[PDB]
Scaffold this active site. Structure first.
Site, PDB file in Angstrom:
ATOM      1  N   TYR A  73       2.810   9.886   0.024  1.00  0.00           N
ATOM      2  CA  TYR A  73       3.650   9.416   0.804  1.00  0.00           C
ATOM      3  C   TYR A  73       5.506   9.602   0.502  1.00  0.00           C
ATOM      4  CZ  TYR A  73      -0.291   6.847   2.457  1.00  0.00           C
ATOM      5  OH  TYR A  73      -1.560   6.234   3.096  1.00  0.00           O
ATOM      6  N   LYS A 116      -2.836   6.161  -4.408  1.00  0.00           N
ATOM      7  CA  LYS A 116      -4.133   6.891  -3.986  1.00  0.00           C
ATOM      8  C   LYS A 116      -3.688   8.325  -4.605  1.00  0.00           C
ATOM      9  CE  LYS A 116      -4.147   4.664   0.544  1.00  0.00           C
ATOM     10  NZ  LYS A 116      -2.750   4.446   0.888  1.00  0.00           N
ATOM     11  N   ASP A 158       1.006  -1.181   0.027  1.00  0.00           N
ATOM     12  CA  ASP A 158       0.022   0.012  -0.140  1.00  0.00           C
ATOM     13  C   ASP A 158       0.982   0.992   0.104  1.00  0.00           C
ATOM     14  OD1 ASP A 158      -1.668   2.078   1.792  1.00  0.00           O
ATOM     15  OD2 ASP A 158      -3.051   0.747   0.583  1.00  0.00           O
ATOM     16  N   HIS A 201      -7.823   9.450  -2.047  1.00  0.00           N
ATOM     17  CA  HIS A 201      -7.226   9.563  -0.752  1.00  0.00           C
ATOM     18  C   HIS A 201      -8.316  10.129   0.424  1.00  0.00           C
ATOM     19  CE1 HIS A 201      -2.894   9.417   1.124  1.00  0.00           C
ATOM     20  NE2 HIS A 201      -3.782   9.142   2.099  1.00  0.00           N
TER      21      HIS A 201
HETATM   22  N1  LIG Z   1      -5.129   6.443   3.506  1.00  0.00           N
HETATM   23  C1  LIG Z   1      -4.815   7.114   4.487  1.00  0.00           C
HETATM   24  O1  LIG Z   1      -5.573   8.071   4.796  1.00  0.00           O
HETATM   25  C2  LIG Z   1      -3.877   6.486   5.408  1.00  0.00           C
HETATM   26  C3  LIG Z   1      -3.342   7.312   6.544  1.00  0.00           C
HETATM   27  C4  LIG Z   1      -2.381   6.803   7.344  1.00  0.00           C
HETATM   28  C5  LIG Z   1      -1.578   5.686   7.126  1.00  0.00           C
HETATM   29  N2  LIG Z   1      -2.141   4.683   5.896  1.00  0.00           N
HETATM   30  C6  LIG Z   1      -1.668   3.707   5.735  1.00  0.00           C
HETATM   31  O2  LIG Z   1      -0.914   2.742   6.479  1.00  0.00           O
HETATM   32  C7  LIG Z   1       0.331   2.643   6.154  1.00  0.00           C
HETATM   33  C8  LIG Z   1       1.482   3.569   7.101  1.00  0.00           C
HETATM   34  O3  LIG Z   1       1.699   3.247   8.469  1.00  0.00           O
HETATM   35  P1  LIG Z   1       0.469   3.332   9.623  1.00  0.00           P
HETATM   36  O4  LIG Z   1       0.146   4.835   9.774  1.00  0.00           O
HETATM   37  O5  LIG Z   1      -0.459   2.735   9.026  1.00  0.00           O
HETATM   38  O6  LIG Z   1       0.743   2.825  11.033  1.00  0.00           O
HETATM   39  P2  LIG Z   1       0.950   1.252  11.771  1.00  0.00           P
HETATM   40  O7  LIG Z   1       0.861   0.313  10.888  1.00  0.00           O
HETATM   41  O8  LIG Z   1      -0.472   1.482  12.764  1.00  0.00           O
HETATM   42  O9  LIG Z   1       2.204   1.590  12.758  1.00  0.00           O
HETATM   43  C9  LIG Z   1       3.542   1.712  12.083  1.00  0.00           C
HETATM   44  C10 LIG Z   1       4.520   1.961  13.259  1.00  0.00           C
HETATM   45  O10 LIG Z   1       4.387   0.732  13.913  1.00  0.00           O
HETATM   46  C11 LIG Z   1       5.892   0.126  14.120  1.00  0.00           C
HETATM   47  N3  LIG Z   1       5.343  -1.473  13.977  1.00  0.00           N
HETATM   48  C12 LIG Z   1       4.821  -2.179  13.016  1.00  0.00           C
HETATM   49  N4  LIG Z   1       4.869  -3.405  13.382  1.00  0.00           N
HETATM   50  C13 LIG Z   1       4.988  -3.440  14.737  1.00  0.00           C
HETATM   51  C14 LIG Z   1       4.793  -4.618  15.816  1.00  0.00           C
HETATM   52  N5  LIG Z   1       4.513  -5.756  15.554  1.00  0.00           N
HETATM   53  N6  LIG Z   1       5.189  -4.080  16.992  1.00  0.00           N
HETATM   54  C15 LIG Z   1       5.347  -2.867  17.382  1.00  0.00           C
HETATM   55  N7  LIG Z   1       5.614  -1.912  16.386  1.00  0.00           N
HETATM   56  C16 LIG Z   1       5.216  -2.221  15.278  1.00  0.00           C
HETATM   57  C17 LIG Z   1       6.521   0.555  12.832  1.00  0.00           C
HETATM   58  O11 LIG Z   1       7.904   0.135  12.730  1.00  0.00           O
HETATM   59  P3  LIG Z   1       8.852   0.529  13.852  1.00  0.00           P
HETATM   60  O12 LIG Z   1       8.637   0.086  15.197  1.00  0.00           O
HETATM   61  O13 LIG Z   1      10.162  -0.103  13.307  1.00  0.00           O
HETATM   62  O14 LIG Z   1       9.091   1.917  13.789  1.00  0.00           O
HETATM   63  C18 LIG Z   1       5.852   2.026  12.590  1.00  0.00           C
HETATM   64  O15 LIG Z   1       6.694   2.926  13.489  1.00  0.00           O
HETATM   65  C19 LIG Z   1       0.491   2.826   4.650  1.00  0.00           C
HETATM   66  O16 LIG Z   1       0.364   1.820   3.925  1.00  0.00           O
HETATM   67  C20 LIG Z   1      -0.350   3.675   4.617  1.00  0.00           C
HETATM   68  O17 LIG Z   1      -0.973   3.843   3.030  1.00  0.00           O
HETATM   69  C21 LIG Z   1      -3.193   5.029   5.123  1.00  0.00           C
END
Ligand SMILES: NC(=O)c1ccc[n+]([C@@H]2O[C@H](COP(=O)([O-])OP(=O)(O)OC[C@H]3O[C@@H](n4cnc5c(N)ncnc54)[C@H](OP(=O)(O)O)[C@@H]3O)[C@@H](O)[C@H]2O)c1
Length: 308
Positions: free
Chosen positions: A54, A83, A49, A116
């Site tokens: 991004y 997106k 994704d 988006h």
């Molecule tokens: N469409 C939208 O508006 C939108 C908005 C926000 C995000 N997203 C999507 O979501 C993704 C981006 O990340 P996010 O915002 O979704 O956050 P998330 O996945 O909820 O959290 C990511 C964070 O958690 C850490 N992490 C991952 N697995 C873990 C585990 N098992 N245990 C502990 N920590 C862990 C990651 O690496 P570290 O711990 O190594 O730092 C990172 O800092 C993208 O695909 C994006 O497209 C979409």
């Protein structure tokens, strides 16, 4: 094997891997994006994704291309989503924006393309956050007609939306020929989106959870990771709270795209299919106090963005 979920609203019943790898900016991350994606592919990840906003499309594309050249995977095995950003969320700027994303990703087609946000802003320049003064009226009907055209052009295999409320989805459905295949919204143990999830299911719209682990520790105190009740559930299963979170989402019938560039953590996010939660686990989780983590891309925020 990683389970897949049929995108009901697609004529070809496309199968989307239930778990995918995210690529949104990580404030506390200095890891190599390309290398992380290649490692993910080697581990089994096929669903990726990304988004024009991004800044990761380039690196992701380099990774997919190299992986395909090395014979680690085939384009057909991959499910790539990108997106349409707010600045290009205008009827006649949709296709050009998609073509630009494809060029950046070095891909001929996307498996899924999403609007988006249900917002439009000054075209031609990426600025984050978005100043409210730069917002412009969003022509849902006109933009969706262009997304539908993108399907006919074969630029994407499916089209959907992101951050759309039930109210906005109801509006979209009233002017859509092709129903949205997906709605990507924030969904984690502290923001379960029950009503939205039910609405989407009722209309064949598959839900994809973003920020499923509330961005881990990249944004200070994590409401979910710090939940004593959740810590107890994780401890009882011999799993992590993150694993409890992803398993719950899977059991709720939604897809999710956690982002992890850590070799160990990205693998742990895949190890959620040979065990399950208990009836009591669900009763406890259904009791968690709700709190939305992501407010919107504008500055200041729009209190009515999600119609809630
Ligand atoms: N469409 C939208 O508006 C939108 C908005 C926000 C995000 N997203 C999507 O979501 C993704 C981006 O990340 P996010 O915002 O979704 O956050 P998330 O996945 O909820 O959290 C990511 C964070 O958690 C850490 N992490 C991952 N697995 C873990 C585990 N098992 N245990 C502990 N920590 C862990 C990651 O690496 P570290 O711990 O190594 O730092 C990172 O800092 C993208 O695909 C994006 O497209 C979409």
């Amino acid at each position: 094997e990683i389970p897949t979920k049929v995108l009901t609203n697609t004529s070809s019943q496309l199968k989307m891997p239930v778990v995918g790898m995210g690529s949104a900016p990580d404030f506390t991350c200095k890891k190599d994006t390309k290398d992380a994606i290649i490692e993910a592919i080697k581990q089994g990840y096929r669903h990726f994704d990304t988004a024009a906003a991004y800044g990761s499309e380039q690196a992701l594309g380099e990774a997919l291309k190299e992986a395909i050249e090395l014979g680690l995977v085939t384009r057909d095995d991959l499910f790539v989503t990108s997106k349409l950003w707010v600045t290009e969320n205008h009827p006649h700027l949709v296709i050009p924006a998609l073509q630009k994303s494809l060029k950046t990703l070095q891909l001929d087609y996307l498996d899924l393309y999403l609007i988006h946000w249900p917002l439009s802003s000054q075209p031609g320049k990426f600025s984050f956050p978005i100043d409210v003064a730069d917002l412009l009226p969003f022509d849902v009907k006109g933009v969706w007609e262009s997304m539908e055209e993108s399907l006919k052009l074969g630029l994407t295999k499916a089209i959907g939306v992101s951050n759309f409320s039930v109210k906005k989805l109801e509006n979209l459905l009233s002017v859509a020929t092709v129903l949205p295949a997906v709605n990507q919204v924030e969904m984690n143990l502290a923001w379960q989106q029950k009503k939205l999830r039910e609405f989407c299911n009722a209309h064949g719209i598959v839900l994809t959870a973003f920020s499923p682990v509330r961005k881990g520790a990249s944004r200070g105190p994590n409401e979910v990771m710090e939940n004593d009740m959740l810590k107890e559930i994780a401890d009882a299963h011999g799993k992590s709270v993150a694993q409890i979170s992803l398993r719950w989402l899977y059991e709720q019938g939604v897809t999710f795209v956690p982002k992890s560039y850590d070799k160990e953590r990205m693998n742990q996010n895949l190890r959620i299919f040979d065990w399950s939660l208990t009836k009591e686990d669900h009763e406890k989780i259904a009791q968690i106090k709700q709190n939305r983590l992501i407010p919107g891309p504008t500055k200041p925020g729009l209190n009515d963005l999600y119609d809630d």
